[PDB]
Amino acid sequence: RDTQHLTVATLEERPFVIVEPADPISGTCIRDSVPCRSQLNRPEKRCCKGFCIDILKRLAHTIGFSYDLYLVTNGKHGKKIDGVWNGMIGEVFYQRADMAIGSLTINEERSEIVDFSVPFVETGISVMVAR
Amino acid sequence: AAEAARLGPAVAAAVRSPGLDVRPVALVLNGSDPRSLVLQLCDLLSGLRVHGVVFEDDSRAVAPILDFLSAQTLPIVAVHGAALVLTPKEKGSTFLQLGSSTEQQLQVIFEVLEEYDWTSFVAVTTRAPGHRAFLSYIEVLTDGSLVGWEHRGALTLEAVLSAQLRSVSAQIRLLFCAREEAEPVFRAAEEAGLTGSGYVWFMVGPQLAPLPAGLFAVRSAGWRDDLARRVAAGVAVVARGAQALLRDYGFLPELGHDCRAQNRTHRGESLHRYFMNITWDNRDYSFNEDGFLVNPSLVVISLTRDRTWEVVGSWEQQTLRLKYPLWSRYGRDTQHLTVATLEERPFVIVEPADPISGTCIRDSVPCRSQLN
Amino acid sequence: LSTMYRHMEKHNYESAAEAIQAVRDNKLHAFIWDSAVLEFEASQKCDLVTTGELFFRSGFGIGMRKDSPWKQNVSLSILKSHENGFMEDLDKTWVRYQ
Amino acid sequence: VLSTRKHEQMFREAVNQANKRSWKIQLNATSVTHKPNAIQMALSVCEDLISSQVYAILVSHPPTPNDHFTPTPVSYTAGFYRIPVLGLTTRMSIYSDKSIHLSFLRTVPPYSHQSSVWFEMMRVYSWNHIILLVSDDHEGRAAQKRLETLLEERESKAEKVLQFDPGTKNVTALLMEAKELEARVIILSASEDDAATVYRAAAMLNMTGSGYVWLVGEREISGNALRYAPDGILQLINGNESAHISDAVGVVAQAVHELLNITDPPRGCVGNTNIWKTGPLFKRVLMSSKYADGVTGRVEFNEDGDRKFANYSINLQNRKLVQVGIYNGTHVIIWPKPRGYQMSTRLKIVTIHQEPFVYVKPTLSDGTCKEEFTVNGDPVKKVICTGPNDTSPRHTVPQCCYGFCIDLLIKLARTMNFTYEVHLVADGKFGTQERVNKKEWNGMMGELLSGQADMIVAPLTINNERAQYIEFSKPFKYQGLTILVKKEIPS
Ligand SMILES: *[C@@H]1O[C@H](CO)[C@@H](O[C@@H]2O[C@H](CO)[C@@H](O)[C@H](O)[C@H]2NC(C)=O)[C@H](O)[C@H]1NC(C)=O
Ligand SMILES: *[C@@H]1O[C@H](CO)[C@@H](O)[C@H](O)[C@H]1NC(C)=O
Ligand SMILES: *[C@@H]1O[C@H](CO)[C@@H](O)[C@H](O)[C@H]1NC(C)=O
Ligand SMILES: *[C@@H]1O[C@H](CO)[C@@H](O)[C@H](O)[C@H]1NC(C)=O
Ligand SMILES: *[C@@H]1O[C@H](CO)[C@@H](O)[C@H](O)[C@H]1NC(C)=O
Ligand SMILES: *[C@@H]1O[C@H](CO)[C@@H](O)[C@H](O)[C@H]1NC(C)=O
């Protein structure tokens, strides 16, 4: 279009971003999700829904977006290795995307390397045991 | 108007200590050779020390020459449109004006528009001087409060203008152009099917095809004043200023009057504090240093089907006095269904919306009653 | 809930501890305030209790003027303190254990 | 209308070179020297419009007595006759408004346009802050308005725009409000005499900030002020006059050729109050006229009626005139350049009494309140905080503040190397928007936004209506609104 159309990378976290194959004969899912491609470097077009996708849709409606989900493959979330960054945060650090919706806990190193937005749900290390 | 100024009723109205010559200009020469008139009035002021000034010529561009004359010398007051236009001027001129500023007209119009129909919407204005300031004041005065906004309607002036004019849909419209430029716009609107009872046009510019019945304008309170009355009022104002400066300062100086002199000192430019407090004819004149009067008396008038202007509303002391009722609308005809109801406490609750402000919280709808 | 707001205009305590002291007696039945204060008051008074579930769950925050160079470094230091366990120790020292 | 009677000598040759290149009529050009009698020029222009039937007038005059005197009466006469007049050697911003001068077209950019040049220079070195010092005159106000709107376009409020009173001695008090700031980038825009006076005042007061970044206008770097000029950075080619005169003559000739539609000039200067109906169209076509063959570069204009894309020459290396910078219309160890802003280390912090977070306790007779030990046998850090008494006057008495946020502040100070001086709020309310009599902030937000504050270390919530004007750090405690009630008594 060039300012707009931010490419959005995400990941499959079952509480938040659920990915399902949208091939019930028709080439789409129910009118509650958003089409999601993948990466390889005609792939089957999955589609994502849940919590974070709802936030993405509402934000697109409000501020004005033209997004395209970019389900990531090279690692999960992110962890610096051997002086290089992989995963979702690693991809955002390099010139490959401009937003990384999904489950992405905000830490010190990531915030130093990649500027974050305002948190919208609490999180942290918590422990669960059988009972 | 030689007979009206011959007796000088202002002399009887106001009596002072100095000579107080009856004739302000002593020469009705606002015609051929304006430069010769300027020279003779300067000579007369230098010689006889006159104490009056009148500019009666409804030619509309005559303000700048009067400003230059004031800078070269004595305050100049126009009575009648020399004073009908208000513009920023050099501090070296003691110009005196009787008209209403564009900002004051905007504030009066937007105060009266809060009763009948609160939708400014169309704000069409041509490429004319002061249009940017008018748009800026439109933007400022609509911040907060309750007035809605629909469009801006920038255009330059037939059919191509008619299409742009009809592009924006509204009921109340504001026009800003010159008096000569007004007629083409009205012709285009009539050709565009807009000059009807379903629309009202607010002629807000400094002025003063048949005009539509919905033509509301705002002018000063002295619009209906007689020429002798206006001359007397101006003479009274200048006399009050002179007496105030002579009494408060405790001195009797000369108000310049060194017309066409040589190597005149420019240290003294003008003074305006002496005219801050004026009261005459039960009217309060503030006379701000720019040239206009703070909180003046204004009249909102309308154009009837007989092409005769009538006094519709009065604006004074931040107060609006009107005559017509308020109800809802002039009639848009399919829409606007009148809805009758009743007070059933579970369902339709009625409360008096007078907590100082004339409305309730932003959760209800205004409700009138009936009396017949 | 705009009408609700009207009911809060007749009474609006121009303080914070004053309203709690008033609630200590029967002059103001229900108080509405940030949880991190009411919880401590309940723990340290043994007479007032918190009812309902949390709503408008937006946290505190150090402020700074718009377009200021301190934003990045202050946010970084706050996050490092959160991870370091300093904030937990501070909360234990000054809020809990009453 | 002519300077030194030398331009008029070549005016006939310039007209003839452009007259035929033809037909139509042949306009005769007449020039009259400027006079102080304010009467002779009226007769001269009347004769010119009566016999020669002049379709335009030209303005060009040396400094002489005050510059904004000479062109005003001729512009007024033109406005009376609604005849366009081309001005030269004058760049006063007062002529930029057509309300007073309906018929006045200026071919030289005014001082207000230099705001765009200053913006470009700011973009050159990427300065995120700026200080404005403009004279309290029409030109200064116009320049300040232009710079303010241009900067607010990029979503950044100007930091400390100030006003300086013109024609006033001992303006050092203004420097009193211009010394404890946080930016070294300052822009000065005043009259040449005013600039010289303020430069001399800085010279005797010797706090000139020499060797630091300054941005001034062409008038401020004039030769009169150059005698006492401190370290400077704006030169314009026009300051030739003959080239501009030839360009204007060519523009007039092109307009006349394209004019071929009444175009009846006023034969009688006096005795007629009517105006030229063709005059507005004439002014419109000059405004829309394009002259790409101008000697002095491109001769494009703008909506206001002033020429654009001019010649901009940029350091004051001992009265040097080196144009190191590169800018022509659209070409978008310390310079007498370093970072524009220097961060402060004396942050003033605002805090509000909240029971679990910021305990406030009265001090002791000596001056410092009694030291206390925690249950774990560790000292409790407390800071002397200056705050109001009572809630009834407003008397400030130093108490001592401690608790949670004070501990956090101390840790921040240790980890950041910056001193602090805490200072409680006055009203006592946290902060909200309130209508006055336009809406204004009141509370702690009032102190932070414009008052005496730099940070607000207090239990401040985060929401949309607050983050618009205040930057919020990342949260340091999570919570939510909840309701407190009295427990029922229990046998
Ligand atoms: C934010 O903090 C960082 C680290 O404490 C600062 O980074 C250094 O700051 C010093 C002094 O300002 C510079 O000389 C160094 O070049 C910076 N980088 C490094 C790697 O040391 C940074 O300046 C701080 N920013 C602000 C606005 O205070
Ligand atoms: C042109 O104007 C000048 C003005 O001084 C006059 O002397 C000259 O006679 C005029 N010539 C013609 C041909 O009009
Ligand atoms: C000039 O202004 C400064 C700052 O207010 C003041 O200290 C000084 O006394 C003033 N000098 C004169 C002569 O007014
Ligand atoms: C700007 O470009 C024009 C057109 O080539 C030229 O006439 C003028 O001298 C240039 N000015 C500068 C300062 O480079
Ligand atoms: C401030 O208030 C304290 C309260 O104990 C009191 O002791 C002190 O005298 C007051 N000081 C002033 C100046 O009012
Ligand atoms: C702390 O700041 C002061 C003043 O800016 C400076 O003199 C000192 O060197 C700094 N120390 C450190 C460790 O940054």
Side-chain angles (χ1 to χ4, degrees), chain A residues 74-81 83-88 90-112:
Chain A
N74 183 20
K76 37 178 297 177
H77 288 151
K79 164 233 269 174
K80 186 167 201 145
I81 280 288
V84 86
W85 267 109
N86 88 305
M88 156 174 331
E91 169 194 321
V92 162
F93 178 37
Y94 304 126
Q95 316 289 340
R96 221 166 303 148
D98 256 356
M99 205 181 45
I101 220 67
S103 84
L104 180 51
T105 298
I106 284 176
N107 215 314
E108 190 270 350
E109 311 170 357
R110 312 200 197 139
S111 181
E112 176 147 11

Side-chain angles (χ1 to χ4, degrees), chain B residues 16 45 49-51 70 75 94 238 241-242 245 252-256 274-275:
Chain B
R16 27 178 262 193
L45 164 67
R49 309 254 78 85
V50 293
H51 300 108
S70 175
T94 325
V238 51
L245 80 95
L252 304 309
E254 193 35 73
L255 322 172
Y274 313 132
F275 323 113

Side-chain angles (χ1 to χ4, degrees), chain B residues 18-19 21-22 24-26 30-36 38-42 44-47 49-54 56 59 61-65 67-71 75 78 80-83 86-88 90 92 94-110 112-113 115-117 119-120 122-124 126 128-131 133-138 140-142 144-150 153-156 159-160 162-163 165 167 169-171 173-179 181-189 192-207 209-223 225 227-228 231-239 241-245 248 250 252-256 259 261 264-266 268 270 272 274-275 277-278 280 283 285 287-292 294-302 307-309 311-316 319-320 322-331 334-342 344:
Chain B
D21 44 289
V22 159
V25 292
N30 37 36
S32 294
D33 218 312
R35 332 289 154 223
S36 97
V38 163
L39 295 180
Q40 57 90 1
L41 70 90
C42 273
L44 166 80
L45 164 67
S46 73
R49 309 254 78 85
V50 293
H51 300 108
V53 48
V54 50
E56 180 244 313
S59 290
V62 85
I65 63 146
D67 311 322
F68 183 69
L69 290 195
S70 175
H80 33 56
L86 258 284
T87 37
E90 188 178 0
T94 325
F95 208 47
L96 325 172
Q97 310 237 35
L98 285 174
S100 72
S101 154
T102 325
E103 339 289 338
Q104 281 148 339
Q105 282 160 241
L106 255 286
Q107 101 171 341
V108 167
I109 292 306
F110 254 95
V112 47
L113 208 48
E115 282 189 354
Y116 303 159
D117 42 18
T119 169
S120 42
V122 167
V124 280
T126 55
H131 89 279
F134 160 68
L135 255 291
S136 70
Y137 215 60
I138 283 282
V140 157
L141 270 283
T142 195
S145 296
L146 61 93
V147 278
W149 198 231
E150 188 144 339
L155 71 94
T156 289
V160 73
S162 295
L165 179 54
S167 81
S169 80
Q171 270 106 43
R173 293 164 175 272
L174 302 103
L175 281 193
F176 189 33
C177 54
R179 43 150 73 221
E181 198 58 38
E183 303 290 349
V185 185
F186 276 96
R187 274 211 73 258
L194 262 299
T195 62
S197 198
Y199 310 92
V200 59
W201 296 80
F202 265 105
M203 211 302 274
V204 47
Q207 298 93 337
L211 321 162
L215 207 149
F216 286 26
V218 48
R219 221 196 290 174
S220 67
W223 87 268
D225 279 11
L227 190 47
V231 162
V235 167
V237 166
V238 51
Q243 263 220 10
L245 80 95
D248 302 327
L252 304 309
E254 193 35 73
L255 322 172
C259 201
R264 279 268 74 83
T265 68
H266 323 98
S270 166
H272 307 259
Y274 313 132
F275 323 113
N277 180 232
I278 306 289
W280 198 76
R283 322 284 254 280
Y285 278 34
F287 215 81
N288 172 258
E289 71 274 4
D290 295 316
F292 36 65
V294 154
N295 196 257
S297 176
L298 319 88
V299 179
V300 196
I301 71 187
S302 83
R307 313 279 93 86
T308 293
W309 303 99
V311 168
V312 190
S314 83
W315 202 102
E316 196 270 331
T319 312
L320 259 168
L322 300 98
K323 156 243 175 178
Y324 265 110
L326 81 87
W327 283 13
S328 281
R329 206 165 300 258
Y330 261 129
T334 86
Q335 319 292 310
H336 226 314
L337 314 95
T338 87
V339 195
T341 177
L342 190 33
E344 208 60 47

Side-chain angles (χ1 to χ4, degrees), chain C residues 22-33 35-52 54-63 65-89:
Chain C
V23 154
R24 280 288 306 281
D25 59 85
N26 225 296
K27 262 204 53 55
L28 190 129
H29 315 95
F31 194 35
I32 292 192
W33 203 227
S35 177
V37 179
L38 295 189
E39 185 264 356
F40 172 80
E41 270 334 282
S43 158
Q44 210 221 24
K45 287 226 142 74
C46 311
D47 193 29
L48 297 323
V49 82
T50 88
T51 171
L54 312 186
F55 55 100
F56 185 52
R57 210 171 291 102
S58 34
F60 277 150
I62 300 273
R65 191 159 26 224
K66 181 53 153 321
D67 157 83
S68 204
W70 294 116
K71 147 77 158 65
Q72 180 77 286
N73 267 340
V74 157
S75 159
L76 251 191
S77 172
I78 287 272
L79 284 186
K80 212 195 63 159
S81 294
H82 255 300
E83 142 188 299
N84 212 345
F86 188 92
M87 281 285 158
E88 218 59 39
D89 165 66

